[PDB]
Structure formats: structure tokens, C-alpha cells
């Protein structure tokens, strides 16, 4: 058995989980006089890979009663009787033998929408399951503890009445979470004395359930190849961090850059006003709980060109603990009908279940697309992508980590409706650096190089006023091409 | 003054084709 | 046989499919009392000239197991459900040869996306393999190992805990790895006293493999 122990430190979403199932099935006396009865069938959504299927072997364990389980789409056969009498079984045999827990999974297949599928085989199936949970009518005895990820994918016509209008969503294990699933799963493992578990919850912060126990086992095969009682040492856990791969960002495998808060920005003011309001709601949340304001979630960035707008993009990728989806630019808009306007969301809705994130929405003049005077500019009005950027723009929002970073290098193009107070409430314009703004960019190229003795410095940064912070790349550059040329001419 | 220099075919979903699996 | 010496290249990532499948199996009682055994899949992806094929060649013959080998979309017959009992019979004649290596090929079709996909038969072979995967649980096993491209066609219900989660790509080599793949090529071959390898590689820039 798996006892309480299996999911320890979430009792955020665990002890109010245990009032949907347990709760009524304790005692059937707090139903009485009371009026109308809630919990007849619970929908539970949230990041999958967490323990969907362990937190149905707990209940099991704790409760007593008889568990009846289904492994989800085993079911999927083309014989009458072999996915119609099954599923039949499951309702009847638990009613005689009370209580009547039930448990399925991986209904992301099963049950779609009604548009895919019209009068076969599958979905003659999924519609015995719709009159077989309204058929149960014991007081307090059945209860569906059905889990499921993917939202979008579950047809809304089991959500009708009281089959699944109670919607419970698992919280992501951050305050103290994380910090006991690491600990069940090196009490049966062998490690060394010279780990900190409280060091090694806070330097990640991307975390999916599912990974928690793939970082830990890395680990282990890092004592293998190094030695060829054994124990996971310090440097075992340390390799980790360079190949995180938590199950949701399974997209993102671009190339990211080292950036140690020197290689970046010739400006500290408006570098440290976009870190304080990106760093405090990930944290801890008591801040803004206690002053009551709104979090800003996402920032605009505008100005010229060439300036350090998508050069500090790479900089919140790495040294920010919330995790980076980045796309380029105008890539997420496919050629057909309805994949076009689904596009935009599945990258949402993956990211937004797990998210200490920030995105990184790239050219917003292909997005905005100036709808002002459209005219049927995409044709048969397929520019619906500013508006269903809306649909997942403030929705569900209370605490949850979205920041849309926007470079973009003309503002006018850009619709006032994003603009608006309720969306976007920092507005950041990255100005020309001045003459002592200049001498950080170019000691940030001219940090970790090879390099002569001093020459004169500041009479650079006084001679080229008048031009953008990628400009003095070009002249760093020559002056490096030009160290290349006559060494080749040194050699005899 | 501005003319509308194309149309932009951004639909059509196509044909499909079963496989009828045989009983026995 | 192949062996290993007809792999060329790619030094970097040779080490991490040994000891996924070799160590498992040279040393069953190094994984005990350590937890549980971590490597239970991999993906190979990238582009397809890159020797991905040959690579569960090397498997099959360097060490001393049982065989079966599984194609692409092969499995696919007119009758009452074969399609999900006949790759349900590759996983069982596995469990019964343990310890034993298997292989799946061409995974750009049998499991694709499921939002995607359209039909009856294809999105039953992609539900068929979340089930019997996750729910093996046997020790010293056949895991299994899958060469195909475009990664992104993968469902992310394969990606999870437990079916890949250790997937490498094959990389493009740029700078001293193609001089071992023409090393290899031209081991077989007698070449005359007038080529010069180190100078071939050095020319060219772009090649797959
Ligand atoms: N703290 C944890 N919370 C949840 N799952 C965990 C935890 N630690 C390890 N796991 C593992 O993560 C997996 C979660 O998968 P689960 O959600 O039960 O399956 P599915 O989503 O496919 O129905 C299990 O293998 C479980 O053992
Ligand atoms: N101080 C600097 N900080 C960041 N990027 C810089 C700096 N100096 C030069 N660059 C380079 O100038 C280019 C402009 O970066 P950025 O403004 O972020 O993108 P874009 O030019 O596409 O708007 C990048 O290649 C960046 O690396
Ligand atoms: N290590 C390797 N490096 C480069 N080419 C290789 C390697 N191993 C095999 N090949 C080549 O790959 C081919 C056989 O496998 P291949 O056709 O690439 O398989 P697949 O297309 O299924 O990935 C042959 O041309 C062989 O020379
Ligand atoms: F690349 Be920037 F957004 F112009
Ligand atoms: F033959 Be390979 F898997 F394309």
C-alpha cells in the first residue's frame, strides 16, 4: 500500500480533496436537512503527472471500501460487448458491494467532441457512461474520482447538470511541496551525507510531478559512469541542472545563452524595475496578499531598433526561476482552418498548468496585425488571432505566473485593446544610452576576451553618439576581424 | 484609393477516405 | 554483425545508449539497493541519415539476448481488433524470452498526435501503447528503443515518467566527426597511396552521415 505518505506537503489540494470523497462517505448525517446534495461526481484538472492514479490507490488505503480499477483506454476494442458490458460491470458490481468508488483516467480520447465522430462505434460507447452515472442514485455511495488533463479535449456535455459541475484543480506543490516527495523517494534509495534538500527545491523551480522523481534518478546513473554503499554524492545532483526536461516543456529545446547579469543592459534603472515586479509574486505570495493591488502580468517593450529588446529576452530565460517558452515571432499561425486559432492556445494552455513561466511572444506587428481598417485582409475573416489571444489573456489569473514579454520595434501598429489597463499596466521604453551607458556595452564585449593593455576608452563612447547599442557591436567586431587578418600574415 | 491585392485562402479542409476493417 | 567499431562519431552520445542497455544487463545487482532502475526508453530523433537505424544493429549483436523486431505500420490487418492484440503479441513474446531487446521502428504514425489524428484504427493504436507500456513492470526487461524523425509529431502522453524520458538526438557533426566516419567507411575498402583523410573532412562542411 501507499498510505498517506505517497503525495506529503500538498495538503493545500489534499486535505480538500479528502472533503469531496471521503468526507461524505465517513457519514451520511451532515447531508441531512442541509437541503441539496453537492458532491454526486467531482472533475479534477490540473498539471497530469502529479499522482492522478496514486492519490486513487490513497483513497483506497485510508478509506475503507471497495475499489473497482480502470486503467482507462484497455477498453478500446471492435467487439460488441467486450467496451459496452464491461463498462456496465464497473457500476453494478460496486452498487451490491458498498461503498462505491470508481475510478477512470485518460479520457482524453474517450468522450470527444461531437463534431469529430457522428454515429459509430465510439461513440455509441462514451454515450452509456452519460445515463449509467445519472442511473446511480444511491445517497452519498457513488462518486466519480475521475482524472483527466487536457481540458480542451472533454466534450462540455458531461458538465450539464451534476455529473461533473464540481471542478477541483491540483495546486502545484511549491510552498513546502516539493520538499516530501524527495523525501519518500530516498528512504528506500542509498545516499550520501553531503545533500541539502531545502537547496535543491529552490534552485529549480519548474517542476511537473512527473520529473520530481526523473531528476533524483539521473543522479543516480552519474555514480555509475564515474566509479566503474555506494551513495549519491554532491556533483551527481549538481549534473542535473543542465539537462532539467521537465514533461510540459518537451517543445522548447533551443539554445539558451549565458548570461551572468554583466554581458547584458547598459542601463540599471529600468533593469532592476522589470526584475522586482517579475521576481516578487514567485516568491512568496503573503506581499501581495497584504497590500491588496493587482500583479502586473506581462510588459511591453518598444523603442528602436538594435537597442537590447530581445537581447534581455535570452536574460529572463536563464537567471529567472520561472520557466521559458519562447517562439519566433509569426510561427505559431498554421495554414488551415481551425488550426490556425488552435495553435495559439495549445502553447498556452500546456505552459499555464505548471507555471512559474514567463513567454516570450516575438514581432507583435504580425500579431496585432492592425486590425484598424482590416477589410478582409486574411480573407475569410481568419485575423480572429488578436481577439482569441484575449480569451487567454485575464483568464484565470489569480495567482498564476503569465508573463507576456512583447519586443517589438514599432508601437503603433500594436491595437489599443492589449493596451489596456486591465491586461497590461507597465509600460517600459528602453531609451538611447548616453555617454556613461555606452562604457558598459562595451565592457560587456570586452570581458571575457583576450585583450591588449589599456588603451584610451572613454573617447570611444564620445565619438559615436548617434547610434543604437547594436551599432557598437559592428566595431567590435571589426576590431576582432582585424586581430584575425594579420595573424594569418604573422605565420610566415 | 486602396485596392485589395489579394484574397487569401486561408480554409478547405479536404476529402477523407475510410478503411472499412472486415467482420467475422 | 556490426559491433560497435561501425559506428563512427558521435563519442558524446554512444555512452548514453551502453549503459542504458548494456549495464542493465552485464550487471543486474549493481541497480539493487539503489532504487529503482531509472532507463526504461529512449528516442531517437533528428534527421534520418545520421546512422539511427544501424544503432539497434549494434544492439542486436555485440551482446548475447533474443531479437524481435517490429517496423513501422505493419501491425494494421482487416479483422475484429488485431491491430491492438498483435502489438499487444510482440510485448508478450518479450516477457516470455527475458531477458530479451525489441524494436520499434518508424514512429511518425502509430503514435501520433491525438487532437490531429482522424480515424478508428489509428487512434486506438495510439491509446493500445499507453497501456501496456506503464503497466509493464518487469525487471530486466526488453526496453524499448524507437528511431524515427520529426520529434515534434510525438504525443506527449509518450513523454511522461516512464515510456521515453531519456531521448537524445543525433547530432550533425561539424568539427572532427566526420573523420572517424570515413575511417570506418574506407576500413573495408584498400585505398591507393594518394588520398588523404585528413583533408577530405576538412573541405566539405555539410553532410548527414
Ligand atoms: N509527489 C508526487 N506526486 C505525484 N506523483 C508522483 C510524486 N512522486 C512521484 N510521482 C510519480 O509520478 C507519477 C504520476 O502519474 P499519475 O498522475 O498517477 O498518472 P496519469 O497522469 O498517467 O494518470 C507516478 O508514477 C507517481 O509514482
Ligand atoms: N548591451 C547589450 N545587451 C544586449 N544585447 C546587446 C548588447 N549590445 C549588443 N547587443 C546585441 O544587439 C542585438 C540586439 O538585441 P535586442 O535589442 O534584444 O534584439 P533586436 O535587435 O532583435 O530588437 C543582439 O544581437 C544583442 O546580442
Ligand atoms: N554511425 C554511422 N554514421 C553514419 N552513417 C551511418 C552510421 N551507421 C550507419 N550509417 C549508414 O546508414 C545507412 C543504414 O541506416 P539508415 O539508412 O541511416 O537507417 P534509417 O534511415 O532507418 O535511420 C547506411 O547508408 C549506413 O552506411
Ligand atoms: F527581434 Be526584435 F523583436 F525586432
Ligand atoms: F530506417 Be530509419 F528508422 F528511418
Known amino acids: 500500500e501507499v498510505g498517506y505518505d505517497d503525495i506529503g506537503g500538498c495538503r493545500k489540494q489534499m486535505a480538500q480533496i479528502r472533503e469531496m470523497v471521503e468526507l461524505p462517505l465517513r457519514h451520511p448525517q451532515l447531508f441531512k436537512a442541509i437541503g441539496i446534495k453537492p458532491p454526486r461526481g467531482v472533475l479534477m484538472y490540473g498539471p497530469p503527472g502529479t499522482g492522478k492514479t496514486l492519490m486513487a490507490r490513497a483513497v483506497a488505503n485510508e478509506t475503507g471500501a471497495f475499489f473497482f480499477l480502470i486503467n482507462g483506454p484497455e477498453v478500446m476494442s471492435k467487439m460488441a460487448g467486450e467496451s459496452e458490458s464491461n463498462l456496465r460491470k464497473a457500476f453494478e458490481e460496486a452498487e451490491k458491494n458498498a461503498p462505491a468508488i470508481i475510478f477512470i483516467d485518460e479520457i482524453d480520447s474517450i468522450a470527444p467532441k461531437r463534431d469529430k465522430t457522428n454515429g459509430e462505434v465510439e461513440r455509441r460507447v462514451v454515450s452509456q457512461l452519460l445515463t449509467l452515472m445519472d442511473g446511480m442514485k444511491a445517497r452519498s455511495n457513488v462518486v466519480v474520482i475521475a482524472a483527466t488533463n487536457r481540458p480542451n479535449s472533454i466534450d462540455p456535455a458531461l458538465r450539464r447538470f451534476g455529473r461533473f459541475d464540481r471542478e477541483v484543480d491540483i495546486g502545484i506543490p511549491d510552498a513546502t511541496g516539493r520538499l516530501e516527495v524527495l523525501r519518500i523517494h530516498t528512504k528506500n534509495m542509498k545516499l550520501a551525507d553531503d545533500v541539502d534538500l531545502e537547496a535543491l527545491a529552490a534552485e529549480t523551480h519548474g517542476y511537473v510531478g512527473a520529473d520530481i522523481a526523473s531528476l533524483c534518478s539521473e543522479a543516480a546513473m552519474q555514480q555509475i559512469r564515474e566509479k566503474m554503499s555506494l551513495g549519491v554524492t554532491m556533483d551527481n545532483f549538481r549534473f542535473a541542472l543542465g539537462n532539467s526536461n521537465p514533461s510540459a516543456l518537451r517543445?522548447?529545446?533551443?539554445?539558451?545563452?549565458?548570461?551572468?547579469?554583466?554581458?547584458?543592459?547598459?542601463?540599471?534603472?529600468?533593469?532592476?524595475?522589470?526584475?522586482?515586479?517579475?521576481?516578487?509574486?514567485?516568491?512568496?505570495?503573503?506581499?501581495?496578499?497584504?497590500?491588496?493591488?493587482?500583479?502586473?502580468?506581462?510588459?511591453?517593450?518598444?523603442?528602436?531598433?538594435?537597442?537590447?529588446?530581445?537581447?534581455?529576452?535570452?536574460?529572463?530565460?536563464?537567471?529567472?526561476?520561472?520557466?521559458?517558452?519562447?517562439?519566433?515571432?509569426?510561427?505559431?499561425?498554421?495554414?488551415?482552418?481551425?488550426?490556425?486559432?488552435?495553435?495559439?492556445?495549445?502553447?498556452?494552455?500546456?505552459?499555464?498548468?505548471?507555471?512559474?513561466?514567463?513567454?516570450?511572444?516575438?514581432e507583435l506587428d504580425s500579431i496585432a496585425k492592425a486590425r484598424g481598417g482590416s477589410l478582409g485582409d486574411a480573407g475569410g475573416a481568419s485575423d480572429r488571432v488578436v481577439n482569441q489571444l484575449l480569451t487567454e489573456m485575464d483568464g484565470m489569473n489569480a495567482k498564476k505566473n503569465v508573463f507576456v514579454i512583447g519586443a517589438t520595434n514599432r508601437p503603433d501598429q500594436i491595437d489599443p485593446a492589449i493596451l489596456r489597463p486591465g491586461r497590461l499596466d507597465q509600460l517600459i521604453y528602453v531609451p538611447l544610452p548616453d555617454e556613461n551607458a555606452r562604457l558598459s556595452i562595451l565592457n560587456a564585449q570586452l570581458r571575457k576576451t583576450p585583450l591588449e593593455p589599456g588603451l584610451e576608452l572613454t573617447a570611444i563612447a564620445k565619438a559615436t553618439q548617434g547610434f543604437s547599442g547594436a551599432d557598437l557591436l559592428y566595431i567590435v567586431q571589426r576590431a576582432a576581424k582585424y586581430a584575425i587578418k594579420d595573424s594569418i600574415e604573422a605565420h610566415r | 484609393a486602396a485596392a485589395a491585392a489579394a484574397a487569401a485562402a486561408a480554409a478547405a479542409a479536404a476529402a477523407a477516405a475510410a478503411a472499412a476493417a472486415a467482420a467475422a
Not at chain 1, 496578499?289 to 537597442?307: A, C, E, H, I, R
Not at chain 1, 537567471?319 to 515571432?329: M, T
Request: aromatic share 10%.
Open chain 1, 251 to 362: 517543445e522548447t529545446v533551443v539554445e539558451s545563452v549565458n548570461v551572468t547579469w554583466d554581458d547584458v543592459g547598459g542601463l540599471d534603472e529600468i533593469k532592476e524595475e522589470l526584475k522586482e515586479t517579475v521576481e516578487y509574486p514567485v516568491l512568496h505570495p503573503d506581499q501581495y496578499t497584504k497590500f491588496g493591488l493587482s500583479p502586473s502580468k506581462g510588459v511591453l517593450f518598444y523603442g528602436p531598433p538594435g537597442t537590447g529588446k530581445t537581447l534581455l529576452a535570452k536574460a529572463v530565460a536563464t537567471e529567472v526561476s520561472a520557466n521559458f517558452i519562447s517562439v519566433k515571432g509569426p510561427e505559431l499561425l498554421s495554414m488551415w482552418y481551425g488550426e490556425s486559432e488552435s495553435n495559439i492556445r495549445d502553447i498556452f494552455d500546456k505552459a499555464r498548468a505548471a507555471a512559474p513561466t514567463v513567454v516570450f511572444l516575438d
